[PDB]
Amino acid sequence: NDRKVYVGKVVSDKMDKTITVLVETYKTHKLYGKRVKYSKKYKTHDENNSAKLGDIVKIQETRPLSATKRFRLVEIVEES
């Protein structure tokens, strides 16, 4: 039983690695059936690196080792 390759994109950040990655998925509602796409926000972190202005990455579900943040993974696409 291993740990996924959760991915996403980035929006903004604050002092000394208040890092994050975006979360999203393909799925629908149970009632009126439309392919409307949807999202919710996450909490990863680095030293200062995985951050705003382009950090398309991966994330994890592990021991956070964090305040209320939860992730340790960054497996990327590219940078800007």
Binding site: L31, Y32, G33, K34, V36
Partner: protein, 136 residues
């Protein structure tokens, strides 16, 4: 009939209100606020007798009852039948709802019902305005 804005924006059902809103209720005094109950059975204790004259559709004469329910409000009744209970101050079994042709009244009497028995001029009814122990 387009489904995009249907989870954006929903629809309604019809619009209806149930029957006898000031009924199926037992008024508080300890906590002062009513109970939404829909009880099977209930009582009726009397304040007046009551009668209004102008009847077009029938165009005969017959009175009704003005019986107050709990603790200061107007509650009104009617006696559908050929039996006149020249009485008051009773303790009864309620009948819920209105019979045809009287507006606003929704409260009635079961045959017998602990107060009296009924108009004893009936013996064929065996099941109307007081009729117990009737040879079938």
């Amino acid at each position: 009939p387009t489904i995009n804005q249907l989870v954006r924006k929903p629809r309604q059902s019809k619009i209806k209100k149930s029957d006898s809103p000031a009924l199926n209720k037992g008024f508080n005094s300890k906590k002062k606020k009513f109970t939404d109950l829909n009880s099977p059975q209930k009582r009726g204790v009397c304040t007046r007798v009551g009668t209004m004259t102008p009847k077009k559709p029938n165009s005969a004469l017959r009175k009704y009852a003005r019986v107050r329910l709990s603790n200061n409000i107007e509650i009104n009744a009617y006696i559908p039948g050929i039996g006149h209970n020249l009485q008051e101050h009773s303790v009864v079994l309620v009948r819920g709802g209105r019979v045809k042709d009287l507006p606003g009244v929704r409260y009635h009497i079961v045959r017998g019902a602990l107060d009296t028995s009924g108009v004893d001029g009936r013996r064929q009814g065996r099941s109307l305005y007081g009729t117990k122990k009737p040879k079938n």
